[PDB]
Design an enzyme around this catalytic site. Structure first.
Site, PDB file in Angstrom:
ATOM      1  N   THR A  12      -1.505   2.477   2.502  1.00 12.72           N
ATOM      2  CA  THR A  12      -1.854   3.384   3.608  1.00 12.72           C
ATOM      3  C   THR A  12      -0.859   3.244   4.776  1.00 12.72           C
ATOM      4  O   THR A  12      -0.776   4.194   5.553  1.00 12.72           O
ATOM      5  CB  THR A  12      -3.325   3.177   4.017  1.00 12.72           C
ATOM      6  OG1 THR A  12      -4.059   3.278   2.790  1.00 12.72           O
ATOM      7  CG2 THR A  12      -3.789   4.241   4.980  1.00 12.72           C
ATOM      8  N   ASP A  57      -0.583   3.895  -6.461  1.00 11.92           N
ATOM      9  CA  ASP A  57      -1.974   3.752  -5.916  1.00 11.92           C
ATOM     10  C   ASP A  57      -2.482   2.351  -6.323  1.00 11.92           C
ATOM     11  O   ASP A  57      -2.647   2.138  -7.536  1.00 11.92           O
ATOM     12  CB  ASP A  57      -2.931   4.835  -6.426  1.00 11.92           C
ATOM     13  CG  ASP A  57      -4.392   4.566  -6.067  1.00 11.92           C
ATOM     14  OD1 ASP A  57      -4.682   3.838  -5.043  1.00 11.92           O
ATOM     15  OD2 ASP A  57      -5.259   5.067  -6.842  1.00 11.92           O
TER      16      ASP A  57
END
Ligand SMILES: [Ca+2]
Ligand SMILES: [Ca+2]
Lengths: 302, 301
Positions: A12, A57
């Site tokens: 993130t 991810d």
């Protein structure tokens, strides 16, 4: 003057708030750091950011990702003084342990870090995590894979997730030619033994394709030990972690059923170490012997 | 003067040096230790199980045996101390919390690494504190006493911590049954195959505890979600405990595969609570609803 390679592999830290959540934006991380003078202080090392596409991810990444990060370190190894790997926070400790096994003869610092918030936002530890990782990679180098989070530097193959929202190495004090081995996905069960767990349940954990089992057991049922011995006799590697928050396995009924001690290894170190050993041309007995040896600082056996 | 029942169910605390059990040893030693007879201390009665239960070889039937023994003595004493082997004490403490509904006397589980006899034993201190607290500083719950602290029984995790609750320090007692149940407890890791997760969910599994990444993260990995959804379609309850030492699951691909949150429950509480709810003749949906309710202090919603 020191120079640090920064691999933005995922996470993130480099993403952007939208209404539908956090989204990847090509080159956003470096454009934001160009606006942050703390990163350009004369005390700080020079650094360069490369971005992976697509971003990994961390909640849905594989051992092939560990390989790609290690290959990227190897390609840059001679050009920089140290390496920072920006990563999703939820499997950072698995990546850190895997890299510790894959990078043999590592003689420069590799620091994995990340943040749950995009680094410009008020509540983000992104800036502090990247500033410290860069500074530590340059000036106080431990030539190992380390992990930087909640304001501490941990040994990579001794860190375990320590709060939901987040790192500890419960079994080691916090810190504060390059050979790359191959690693591929391996069929490993990681299971928790509990009172009365049945033969039938444990038998199912040992079906194909399982090649190895990590047992998290208590600080001698015939049907459990029978299934474990049968598994070891057909070459399944069974590793016991005395699964509590901290401390060591001291092995004996399990020993006689072919189970070997994982000593004080974290689940992350055991799991990544089995991926490492099963991916080489080793026999079950060689793997059992190497699982018990301290290869990279992951385990204490006096 | 309060009267405390002491069930020496097993563990090293009552043995002799290695360590052998000796019938009556614990009572002969405690009669000689004057600290146990100070006027602040309760009267106590020791019942030594025969044979002793080995805590590393226990089943839910042993949980039920201890619950039955508390139930049998309940009306004769003011409080209960259960001496137990330290390695599965926290499973027994959680399981009793679910079995003993409307408990209105203290039940304190303790034990020690070293025989109470030996100079270096925390036996003496663990049993002194348990007896004193059972009599004098009663919380009417199942508690566990170790490392000089009193924990809620269904919040302790292995040498003991309750990482998701601060340490502690309508009906008569209604006693519920817990029987052995086929439960899988597994840890997700990067790239775990569909084939391995399928294996954890084969018959006769009735429920699965998933230990997954962060605040409830498991891969968007289709092969994992497919197996978890197939399990939900067969009435297999899957509960997500979010792997860290401490903190809570906050759920969503796992929700869409039918997985429910176990919030901040310990693995001991979730495993004993599934044993409890699968033993009570409830439907998968009633078990999913009660898993997420705070029944006995085990979880923060
Ligand atoms: Ca009895
Ligand atoms: Ca019903």
């Amino acid at each position: 003057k020191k120079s640090i390679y920064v691999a933005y592999t995922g996470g993130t830290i480099g993403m952007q708030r939208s209404d539908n959540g956090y989204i990847p934006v090509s080159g956003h991380l470096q454009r934001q750091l160009a606006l942050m003078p703390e990163f350009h202080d004369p005390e700080m090392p020079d650094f360069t950011i490369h971005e992976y596409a697509p971003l990994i991810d961390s909640s849905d990444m594989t051992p092939e990702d560990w390989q790609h990060i290690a290959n990227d370190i190897q390609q840059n190894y001679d050009l920089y003084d140290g390496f920072v790997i920006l990563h999703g926070t939820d499997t950072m400790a698995f990546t850190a342990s895997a890299l510790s096994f894959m990078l043999e003869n590592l003689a420069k610092p590799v620091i994995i870090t990340g943040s749950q918030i995009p680094l410009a936002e008020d509540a983000s530890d992104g800036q502090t995590n990247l500033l410290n990782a860069l500074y530590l990679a340059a000036n106080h180098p431990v030539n190992e894979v380390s992990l930087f989070f909640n304001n501490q530097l941990f040994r990579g193959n001794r860190t375990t997730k320590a709060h939901a929202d987040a790192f500890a190495s419960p079994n080691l004090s916090v810190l504060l030619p390059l050979i790359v081995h191959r690693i591929t996905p391996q069929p490993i069960g990681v299971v928790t033994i509990y009172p009365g767990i049945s033969g039938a349940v444990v038998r199912n954990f040992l079906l194909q394709p399982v090649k190895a089992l990590i047992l998290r057991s208590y600080g001698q049922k015939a049907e459990l030990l029978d299934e474990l011995k049968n598994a070891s006799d057909r070459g399944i590697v069974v590793v016991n972690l005395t699964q509590s928050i901290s401390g060591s396995v001291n092995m004996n009924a399990l020993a006689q059923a072919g189970v070997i001690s994982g000593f004080d290894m974290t689940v992350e170190a055991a799991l990544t170490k089995l991926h490492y050993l099963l991916s080489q041309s080793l026999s079950p007995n060689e793997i059992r012997q190497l699982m018990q040896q301290n290869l990279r600082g992951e385990l204490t056996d006096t």
